[PDB]
Structures are given as C-alpha cells and as structure tokens.
Amino acid sequence: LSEGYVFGMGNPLLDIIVDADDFMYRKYNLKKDNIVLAEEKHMTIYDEIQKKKKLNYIAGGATLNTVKMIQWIIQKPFVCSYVGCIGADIQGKYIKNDCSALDLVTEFQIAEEPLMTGKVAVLVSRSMVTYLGAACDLSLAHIEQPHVWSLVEKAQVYYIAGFVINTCYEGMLKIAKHSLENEKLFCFNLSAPFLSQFNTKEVDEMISYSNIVFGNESEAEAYGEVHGLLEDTVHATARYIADLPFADGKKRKRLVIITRGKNPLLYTDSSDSEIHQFMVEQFKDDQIIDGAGDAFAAGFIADYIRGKPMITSLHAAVKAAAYIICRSGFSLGSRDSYS
Numbered sequence: 368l369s370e371g372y373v374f375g376m377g378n379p380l381l382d383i384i385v386d387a388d389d390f391m392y393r394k395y396n397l398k399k400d401n402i403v404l405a406e407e408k409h410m411t412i413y414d415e416i417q418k419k420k421k422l423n424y425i426a427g428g429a430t431l432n433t434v435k436m437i438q439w440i441i442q443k444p445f446v447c448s449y450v451g452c453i454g455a456d457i458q459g460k461y462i463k464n465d466c467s468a469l470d471l472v473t474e475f476q477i478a479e480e481p482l483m484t485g486k487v488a489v490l491v492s493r494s495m496v497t498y499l500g501a502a503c504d505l506s507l508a509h510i511e512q513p514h515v516w517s518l519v520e521k522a523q524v525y526y527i528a529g530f531v532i533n534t535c536y537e538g539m540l541k542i543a544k545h546s547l548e549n550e551k552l553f554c555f556n557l558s559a560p561f562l563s564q565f566n567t568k569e570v571d572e573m574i575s576y577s578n579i580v581f582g583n584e585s586e587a588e589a590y591g592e593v594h595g596l597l598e599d600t601v602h603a604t605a606r607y608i609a610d611l612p613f614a615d616g617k618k619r620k621r622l623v624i625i626t627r628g629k630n631p632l633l634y635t636d637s638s639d640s641e642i643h644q645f646m647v648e649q650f651k652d653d654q655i656i657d658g659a660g661d662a663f664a665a666g667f668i669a670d671y672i673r674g675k676p677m678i679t680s681l682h683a684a685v686k687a688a689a690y691i692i693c694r695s696g697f698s699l700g701s702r703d704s705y706s
C-alpha cells in the first residue's frame with residue numbers, strides 16, 4: 368500500500384474518562400452505553416468531573432480511532448491520512464502529537480479562539496456526553512486547500528463516521544462524490560441512532576456513495592423505523608441499505624455489515640438475496656458493538672483493502688475489537704503484542 372492510501376475525516380475529540388458516581392447518571396439523565404450531544408442541561412458535567420481525581424485523558428473521535436488503528440494494524444508508516452478541526456489549546460496539541468506518534472499524516476484545522484478542542488465526558492462505573500466544540504468549525508474551505516485536498520486525491524480508501532454530518536456534511540459529501548467518481552472505496556458508519564432519526568436525508572445520501580456501510584443493531588432499528596421497515600426491522604434495514612441506488616446509477620456491490628453485540632453480526636450485499644449470520648467471539652461482560660465498534664471497522668478495512676476475503680476480514684474485525692475490549696478503552700499498545 369502506498370502512502371496516504373487511506374483517508375479519514377471526522378471530529379477530533381479528547382476523551383475524558385472518569386469513574387462516575389451513581390448520582391451522575393440520574394442527574395444528567397444518562398443511559399447505558401449511549402452517546403448524547405451536550406445540551407445546556409449537560410454543560411455542568413465538564414466542570415464537575417474535572418474535580419475528580421485519577422482523570423484519564425485519551426485522544427478520541429470515532430473516525431480518528433478507526434483510521435489510527437488501521438494505520439496501527441498495517442504497520443507501514445504514513446499509509447493513513449486524517450483531517451479534522453481542533454482548538455488552539457493543549458488538548459489539540461495532545462491529539463495532534465498522538466497522531467504523529469502513530470506515524471499518521473494529518474492536516475488539522477485550527478478553529479478561531481477561544482473555541483476549544485471538543486471533548487467527551489466518558490462516565491464509567493459507560494456513558495458518553497459529547498461537546499463537539501472546535502470540531503464544528505471543520506469547513507469546506509480548509510478541505511479544498513491544495514495541500515489538504517492532495518491527501519484526498521492520493522487516497523483510494525475513505526472512512527467517514529456518520530458523526531461528521533453534524534460538523535461538516537458539505538465536506539464529507541464532496542469527498543464521497545469524489546470517491547464514487549473515481550471508483551474508490553468509501554466506507555461509512557451509521558455511528559448513532561439519532562443520525563438516522565434527525566438527519567435521515569444526509570444518511571441516505573451518504574449511503575448512495577458508500578461501498579461499505581457499517582452499523583449496529585440500535586442504529587439499524589432506528590433507521591428501519593424511520594423508513595417504515597416495521598416487520599423484521601434489522602433484516603429489512605440491511606436489505607434496504609444494500610439495495611439503495613448508487614448516486615451515479617452504475618451497478619455495483621455495496622456491502623452492509625450490522626453488528627449485534629454478543630449475538631451474530633449480519634452481512635449482505637446488493638447482489639446477495641440472503642442475509643448471512645456470523646458467529647462472534649464471547650467475552651466477559653463486553654461486546655463487539657462498543658469503542659470496539661470503531662476497532663471492528665478498522666480491523667475489517669485493514670485486511671479487506673489488502674486483498675483478504677470477506678470472511679477473513681470479519682475475523683480480523685472481531686480480532687481488532689477483541690483487542691480494544693481486552694484493554695482499558697481505546698488505547699493502542701505494543702504492536703507485537705497483537706498476534
């Protein structure tokens with residue numbers, strides 16, 4: 368694989384992990400394994416957890432996690448590229464330097480001060496409260512820059528999470544149109560149930576440019592519900608997404624993979640009339656769907672773009688998620704300790 372073969376664009380966020388008290392979940396009305404965008408009623412959570420001791424700071428972002436692990440798996444330096452918007456703060460410096468350590472080529476945009484780098488309150492006891500911050504300032508102007516668009520041009524594989532719809536939809540759309548036009552591999556993730564509910568137009572449009580669509584059970588149920596797929600919603604959703612017309616009208620295979628936690632994941636394509644089950648490895652009160660979901664995408668892509676068949680890539684996907692599960696959160700340790 369050549370340098371900058373894989374391109375990613377998303378929201379560069381700093382994960383603030385803290386052992387949360389029981390009242391925290393009731394106080395801010397947080398559910399299990401869920402992600403919510405920080406509203407006004409949530410804003411006090413960031414000062415509240417900052418008083419806590421033993422705070423752990425990890426470079427996050429759905430797309431960034433996937434891309435940097437793909438880079439980590441392939442081992443060859445500078446194969447992956449990433450674009451996002453951080454703030455002019457120490458948090459942005461932490462994220463930037465964490466990418467350079469992994470030999471990840473980046474072209475970060477710096478938001479206008481005092482807009483700080485986005486952050487995610489990770490309350491473990493595991494719920495997430497997300498303040499996008501500077502990640503919102505990601506603009507088409509920064510992307511259309513010569514030294515930035517060069518990374519898009521040189522890439523043959525793209526990964527963009529659905530989260531980027533809230534921040535820079537116009538940017539991800541332009542990259543998607545580029546990918547389909549040049550017959551490249553565009554990989555898309557449903558990311559969160561609320562995206563299919565409140566941004567249905569954006570999701571379906573992105574699907575029309577996607578060669579591979581990632582998602583989980585809850586995202587599929589929300590997507591199928593908003594599309595009127597009532598009976599056998601999950602199975603109907605995978606079929607619906609797989610069979611949607613591509614935006615250029617050309618006939619090609621779109622792959623759809625739906626994770627279902629500890630239960631068998633589903634996969635199918637446009638030319639496949641059957642929806643296949645895939646048995647997944649069991650763990651100790653943990654699952655493939657979640658942090659691990661981003662790793663699942665990374666593990667699948669890292670092998671699939673290197674010629675590995677569907678089944679083999681799925682095992683590589685489970686392997687990648689199992690690695691993140693075995694560790695505390697999304698942190699990439701020694702490469703030789705990955706087998």
Ligand SMILES: Nc1ncnc2c1ncn2[C@@H]1O[C@H](CO)[C@@H](O)[C@H]1O
Binds near residue numbers: 427432499658659661
């Ligand atoms: N709105 C969001 N946009 C992009 N990434 C997010 C968002 N919310 C949570 N994440 C990231 O998702 C990961 C967990 O799957 C964490 O690294 C976290 O930073």
Ligand SMILES: [Cl-]
Binds near residue numbers: 376428430431
């Ligand atoms: Cl993202």
